[PDB]
Amino acid sequence: GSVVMTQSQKFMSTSVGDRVSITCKASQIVGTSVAWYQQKAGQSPKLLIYWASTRHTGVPDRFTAGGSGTDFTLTITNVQSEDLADYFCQQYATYPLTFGSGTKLELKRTDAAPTVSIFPPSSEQLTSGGASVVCFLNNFYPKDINVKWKIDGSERQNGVLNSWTDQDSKDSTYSMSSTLTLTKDEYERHNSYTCEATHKTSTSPIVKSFNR
Amino acid sequence: GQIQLVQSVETGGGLVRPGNSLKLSCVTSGFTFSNYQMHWLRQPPGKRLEWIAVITVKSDNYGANYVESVKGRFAISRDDSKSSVYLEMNRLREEDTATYFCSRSGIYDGYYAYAMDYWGQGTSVTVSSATTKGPSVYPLAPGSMVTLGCLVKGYFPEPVTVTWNSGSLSSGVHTFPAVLQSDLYTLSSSVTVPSSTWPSQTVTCNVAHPASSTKVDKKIVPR
Amino acid sequence: EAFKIGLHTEFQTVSFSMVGLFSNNPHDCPLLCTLNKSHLYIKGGNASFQISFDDIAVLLPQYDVIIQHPADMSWCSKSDDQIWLSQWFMNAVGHDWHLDPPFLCRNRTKTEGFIFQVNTSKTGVNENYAKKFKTGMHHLYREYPDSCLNGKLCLMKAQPTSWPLQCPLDHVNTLHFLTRG
Amino acid sequence: FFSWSLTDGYCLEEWMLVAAKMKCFGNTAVAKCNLNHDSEFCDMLRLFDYNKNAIKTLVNLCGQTINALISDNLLMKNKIRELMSVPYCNYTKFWYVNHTLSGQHSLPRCWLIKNNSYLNISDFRNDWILESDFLISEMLSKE
Ligand SMILES: *[C@@H]1O[C@H](CO)[C@@H](O[C@@H]2O[C@H](CO)[C@@H](O[C@@H]3O[C@H](CO)[C@@H](O)[C@H](O[C@H]4O[C@H](CO)[C@@H](O)[C@H](O)[C@@H]4O)[C@@H]3O)[C@H](O)[C@H]2NC(C)=O)[C@H](O)[C@H]1NC(C)=O
Ligand SMILES: *[C@@H]1O[C@H](CO[C@@H]2O[C@@H](C)[C@@H](O)[C@@H](O)[C@@H]2O)[C@@H](O[C@@H]2O[C@H](CO)[C@@H](O[C@@H]3O[C@H](CO)[C@@H](O)[C@H](O)[C@@H]3O)[C@H](O)[C@H]2NC(C)=O)[C@H](O)[C@H]1NC(C)=O
Ligand SMILES: *[C@@H]1O[C@H](CO[C@@H]2O[C@@H](C)[C@@H](O)[C@@H](O)[C@@H]2O)[C@@H](O[C@@H]2O[C@H](CO)[C@@H](O)[C@H](O)[C@H]2NC(C)=O)[C@H](O)[C@H]1NC(C)=O
Ligand SMILES: *[C@@H]1O[C@H](CO)[C@@H](O[C@@H]2O[C@H](CO)[C@@H](O)[C@H](O)[C@H]2NC(C)=O)[C@H](O)[C@H]1NC(C)=O
Ligand SMILES: *[C@@H]1O[C@H](CO)[C@@H](O[C@@H]2O[C@H](CO)[C@@H](O)[C@H](O)[C@H]2NC(C)=O)[C@H](O)[C@H]1NC(C)=O
Numbered sequence: 026g027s028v029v030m031t032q033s034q035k036f037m038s039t040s041v042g043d044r045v046s047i048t049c050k051a052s053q054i055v056g057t058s059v060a061w062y063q064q065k066a067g068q069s070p071k072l073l074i075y076w077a078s079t080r081h082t083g084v085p086d087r088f089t090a091g092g093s094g095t096d097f098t099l100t101i102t103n104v105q106s107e108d109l110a111d112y113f114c115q116q117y118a119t120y121p122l123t124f125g126s127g128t129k130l131e132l133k134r135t136d137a138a139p140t141v142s143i144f145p146p147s148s149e150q151l152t153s154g155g156a157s158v159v160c161f162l163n164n165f166y167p168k169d170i171n172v173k174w175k176i177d178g179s180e181r182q183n184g185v186l187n188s189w190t191d192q193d194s195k196d197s198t199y200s201m202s203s204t205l206t207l208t209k210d211e212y213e214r215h216n217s218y219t220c221e222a223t224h225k226t227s228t229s230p231i232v233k234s235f236n237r
Numbered sequence: 238g239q240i241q242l243v244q245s246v247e248t249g250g251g252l253v254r255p256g257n258s259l260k261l262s263c264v265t266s267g268f269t270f271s272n273y274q275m276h277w278l279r280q281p282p283g284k285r286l287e288w289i290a291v292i293t294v295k296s297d298n299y300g301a302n303y304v305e306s307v308k309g310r311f312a313i314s315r316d317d318s319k320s321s322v323y324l325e326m327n328r329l330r331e332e333d334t335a336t337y338f339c340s341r342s343g344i345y346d347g348y349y350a351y352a353m354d355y356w357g358q359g360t361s362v363t364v365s366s367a368t369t370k371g372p373s374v375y376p377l378a379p380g381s382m383v384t385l386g387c388l389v390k391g392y393f394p395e396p397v398t399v400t401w402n403s404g405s406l407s408s409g410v411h412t413f414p415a416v417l418q419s420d421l422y423t424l425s426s427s428v429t430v431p432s433s434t435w436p437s438q439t440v441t442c443n444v445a446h447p448a449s450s451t452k453v454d455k456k457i458v459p460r
Numbered sequence: 461e462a463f464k465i466g467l468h469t470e471f472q473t474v475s476f477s478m479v480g481l482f483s484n485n486p487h488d489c490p491l492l493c494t495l496n497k498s499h500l501y502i503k504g505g506n507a508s509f510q511i512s513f514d515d516i517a518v519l520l521p522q523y524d525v526i527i528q529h530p531a532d533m534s535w536c537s538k539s540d541d542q543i544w545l546s547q548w549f550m551n552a553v554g555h556d557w558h559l560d561p562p563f564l565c566r567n568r569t570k571t572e573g574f575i576f577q578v579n580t581s582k583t584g585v586n587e588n589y590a591k592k593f594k595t596g597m598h599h600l601y602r603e604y605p606d607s608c609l610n611g612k613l614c615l616m617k618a619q620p621t622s623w624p625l626q627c628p629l630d631h632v633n634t635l636h637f638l639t640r641g
Numbered sequence: 642f643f644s645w646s647l648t649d650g651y652c653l654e655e656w657m658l659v660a661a662k663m664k665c666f667g668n669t670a671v672a673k674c675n676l677n678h679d680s681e682f683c684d685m686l687r688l689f690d691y692n693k694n695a696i697k698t699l700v701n702l703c704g705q706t707i708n709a710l711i712s713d714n715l716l717m718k719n720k721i722r723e724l725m726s727v728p729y730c731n732y733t734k735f736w737y738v739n740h741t742l743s744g745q746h747s748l749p750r751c752w753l754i755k756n757n758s759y760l761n762i763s764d765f766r767n768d769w770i771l772e773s774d775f776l777i778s779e780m781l782s783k784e
Contacts, residue, residue, distance in 0.1 A: 200427075484696065611782060
């Protein structure tokens with residue numbers, strides 16, 4: 026029965042000086058009983074807005090907000106670098122108090138293709154009885170990217186562990202790691218292992234492969 | 238005075254096994270603690286912030302409210318003479334793993350409401366039956382610029398620190414967030430150096446896991 | 461003040477002390493004060509409410525306690541004085557428990573605090589009610605500063621407070637409160 | 642006869658008056674308060690006297706006998722006049738004519754307010770003229 030606070034856009038890109046809007050839709054009518062918060066690096070949140078449109082003391086006037094019933098919008102004008110953070114809503118009209126999932130505000134930059142590198146299992150791990158094939162895809166923008174593991178041409182989704190990085194503080198870029206872990210036997214059965222990445226910087230997929 | 242909310246784990250650490258108990262504390266200053274209601278919330282990994290409990294003031298009999306998932310397990314309490322609020326968590330289960338926050342709510346446009354105007358710094362709580370294990374460190378060498386790697390597999394608990402040549406190569410290093418599998422953490426670290434640097438020069442990843450008092454150095458030797 | 465009308469006839473005055481009347485009243489009489497244009501106050505027994513008017517729906521019917529009958533207000537508080545003062549006020553202002561729209565209070569199970577809310581918006585189907593309510597307030601608060609504008613949303617909230625020390629003591633409001641309740 | 646009777650003329654205690662000095666009114670003036678439901682001054686006297694008696698007797702609930710102390714119709718008249726934006730009585734300041742030589746004086750009447758200000762003297766002169774007349778007559782009706 027909890028009120029769901031829906032923030033459908035998990036990531037939003039902007040440039041310094043732009044105006045950005047972050048939306049929130051409550052699954053029930055909550056009037057103006059809504060707050061907005063900023064949070065960085067999973068640290069302590071900071072109150073931005075309450076009663077839907079009232080700015081909290083100490084908050085820059087770049088931040089405004091409005092809405093009612095179910096629809097609420099936080100607007101940041103003349104976005105500054107220090108405004109790059111997660112933003113999320115809250116309803117306090119009824120128990121349990123509930124919060125939105127959050128919208129991460131990130132910086133725009135020129136498109137960049139990933140640097141892809143594939144690495145085979147190490148003899149140390151193989152002696153231990155396992156075999157991990159690692160694939161790095163570094164320094165690409167935007168964060169949208171699709172990675173596939175292909176063994177002898179066939180896609181594999183059993184035994185893949187992926188990890189991502191947030192937008193890099195220096196070059197405003199993203200990076201991903203993908204590890205396909207098999208046992209020594211399943212690994213020795215095949216020959217060709219391929220990391221195939223797809224990104225809007227290339228019509229065809231980037232591909233790296235290791236044989237034997 | 239500066240308004241402060243600082244959290245701590247009363248006894249032991251934030252790492253506990255299911256069925257155990259754990260008391261969080263939140264000590265405050267800079268305001269008349271006894272005039273404000275105090276809350277506990279939690280942010281689970283990859284999930285939205287969650288309200289847990291609230292306790293009001295003496296004039297309202299220190300009344301408390303809880304979310305259903307903790308009713309009968311957690312107990313919020315306060316000590317006004319110490320300006321502190323506490324959360325006693327019993328019958329802990331793995332779903333209780335999260336960063337816990339204490340918070341203050343005040344009065345907003347003239348009306349009391351549970352918007353949170355001050356928060357504590359956060360306290361990491363991990364409920365797990367996994368036993369501590371040191372990482373297995375595996376080199377990742379390929380089969381202008383060259384990329385190498387270091388695979389840190391099968392360790393618990395976090396954290397683990399990874400450097401390359403004791404930091405000399407931090408310029409082109411990507412250390413990725415750990416991922417949990419089989420109740421053990423696994424991460425990878427990549428480093429990009431000029432082809433003139435490797436393999437002519439030694440490139441080594443240094444991985445330290447303090448929990449198990451493990452320190453490993455793996456040189457990336459060519460294949 | 462005083463001046464001479466004739467040679468041996470004088471215009472003279474006598475001014476009653478509100479401090480004296482209130483402080484030396486052995487009865488627990490209800491006090492009604494207009495602190496300024498936005499904040500009103502009412503005190504009875506151990507209960508003391510600040511009354512404010514603005515467009516914030518602090519309470520919502522979906523989540524808060526609907527009051528149709530006075531007895532419903534048993535769910536608004538743990539203090540019989542708060543309930544009694546709220547019922548007394550709604551009676552004195554002219555609220556018709558039978559025919560008028562129900563109002564709202566916060567369930568005492570919640571810890572945000574006691575508060576009750578009345579929709580006094582002078583608009584649409586509520587206009588008549590709002591008007592009546594306005595008239596009621598005009599009788600209870602001498603020189604009532606009506607903040608509710610025509611056609612605009614206006615919700616009254618009454619919540620616990622400490623009696624403002626700078627509140628002008630006006631016994632006429634008390635007389636009307638006793639007369640109308 | 643549901644009307645509280647005043648019995649002491651009548652002397653007002655220091656705490657009843659802003660001047661903080663006891664002030665006594667003669668029997669001739671105060672006797673007019675008996676069964677007079679058209680005098681805000683008598684209403685105030687009855688309020689203060691009922692409260693003084695309550696103090697001396699020590700507690701009841703407030704206003705149970707309110708209609709024995711104050712005139713409801715006169716209160717409603719003053720309210721209506723307030724809402725019509727005409728001068729009205731807010732039951733605080735009262736004026737009277739005093740024959741200082743003999744001490745004979747009229748029954749105090751309300752000093753009316755309008756827009757939160759007491760009327761200027763002239764704006765109700767016909768009142769304190771009339772009262773003075775009455776007073777003189779009363780005096781010579783005693784001599
Ligand atoms: C307090 O009382 C007031 C007055 O009674 C009340 O405000 C009014 O609420 C009604 C709804 O009950 C509002 O009616 C709207 O008015 C116009 C047409 O007159 C339209 O905007 C609306 O209809 C359209 O829009 C809706 C919104 O999306 C749609 O759902 C609908 O299908 C239509 O497309 C609707 O009829 C009325 O406007 C207000 N009046 C004012 C002045 O705001 C208020 O809700 C009460 N508050 C509480 C807390 O009890
Ligand atoms: C009518 O009077 C109310 C009640 O408070 C009155 O005014 C105060 C300034 C003092 O003289 C009080 O003794 C007196 O009761 C006024 O409401 C109050 O408004 C003030 C600001 O004008 C609020 O204080 C400020 O609030 C903000 C947010 O908290 C801060 O930036 C400041 O630090 C400062 O404290 C005060 O909280 C508020 N009180 C309530 C109960 O709401 C009201 O403004 C006044 N109306 C008019 C039209 O004058
Ligand atoms: C006032 O609230 C009580 C308690 O309700 C609980 O707390 C509320 C703030 C809200 O979160 C509810 O969902 C909670 O259940 C109501 O009485 C309880 O109602 C529940 C309904 O499931 C019932 O199981 C309990 O036994 C009830 N407890 C008691 C003591 O009666 C009560 O009905 C509410 N009053 C009104 C007028 O709605
Ligand atoms: C009756 O009305 C008069 C006139 O508005 C009030 O007398 C004034 O009171 C204010 C404070 O409320 C003072 O600042 C003024 O000096 C008073 N005016 C004078 C003495 O001429 C009086 O308070 C009202 N009575 C009540 C009970 O509210
Ligand atoms: C009417 O005026 C007379 C004359 O001032 C007042 O009576 C005097 O009161 C003063 C002050 O207390 C005394 O010093 C005089 O001795 C009194 N003289 C007489 C003859 O009484 C009287 O109090 C006034 N009455 C009212 C009702 O105000």
